[PDB]
């Protein structure tokens, strides 16, 4: 899905 | 403890991957009303994005449940309820965030780096609401614009903070303002602008700003898939 700077 | 105290017990939780505990040493060193370093505010968002994206995370699967024991009464309950307490563990972890930026972090932010960090960390905890709201999402944009003002005029575009709102912001735009228009164009461009920049890029950052750019693009993929 869509990258934030918060997932992962 | 003391400041000193809190921030390497607050290194040592990270690594023992205890989320809470690092978030609980690092809201007291916030709570100590003076001005956080690099370090320190990146160790407290760090921290508070670990325990949120837990409930995040939470949340996304007992949603999904519910919405596939749909027709099975006693289940899509059970469910239900289920998301309804790991929402409210969620807007009780926003508003940590949301009232320690309000009170401590963007009034005594002295600099534009902090600002613009503060101020994009306002609008992410309320884009977190927003996922589970309402009306607060434009308030997730007037802190993200605010910052993307303060942004666009202080900082090269291949500074990490800076692409890493694009990104943000970007995400804000598709997903909560449902407009992949307004949001594939931002990261086309921030994305663009750091590119014909690559010279701007320092050690200290070119894996930060360059790994961001990466994640502009696969945004921007996608969303032509």
Redesign the interface.
């Given at each position: 899905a869509r990258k934030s700077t918060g997932g992962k | 403890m003391d400041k000193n105290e809190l921030v390497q017990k607050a290194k040592l939780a990270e690594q023992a991957e205890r989320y809470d505990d690092m978030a609980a040493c690092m809201k007291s060193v916030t709570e100590q009303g003076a001005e956080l370093s690099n370090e320190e505010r990146n160790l407290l968002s760090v921290a508070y994005?670990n325990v949120v994206?837990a409930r995040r995370s939470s949340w996304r699967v007992v949603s999904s449940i519910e919405q596939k024991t749909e027709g099975a009464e006693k289940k899509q309950q059970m469910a239900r309820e289920y998301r309804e307490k790991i929402e409210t563990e969620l807007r009780d972890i926003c508003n940590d965030v949301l009232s320690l930026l309000e009170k401590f972090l963007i009034p005594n932010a002295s600099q534009a780096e902090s600002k613009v960090f503060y101020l994009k960390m306002k609008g992410?905890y309320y884009r977190?609401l927003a996922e589970v709201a309402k009306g607060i999402v434009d308030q997730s944009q007037q802190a993200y614009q605010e910052a993307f003002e303060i942004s666009k005029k202080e900082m090269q575009p291949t500074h990490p903070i800076r692409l890493?709102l694009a990104?943000?912001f970007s995400?804000f735009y598709?997903?909560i303002l449902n407009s992949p228009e307004k949001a594939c164009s931002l990261a086309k461009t921030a994305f663009d602008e750091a590119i014909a920049e690559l010279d701007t890029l320092s050690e200290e950052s070119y894996k930060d700003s360059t790994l961001?750019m990466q994640?502009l693009r696969?945004?921007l993929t996608?969303?032509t898939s």
């Open positions: - | 994005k994206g992410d977190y890493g990104l943000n995400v598709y997903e961001i994640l696969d945004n996608l969303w």
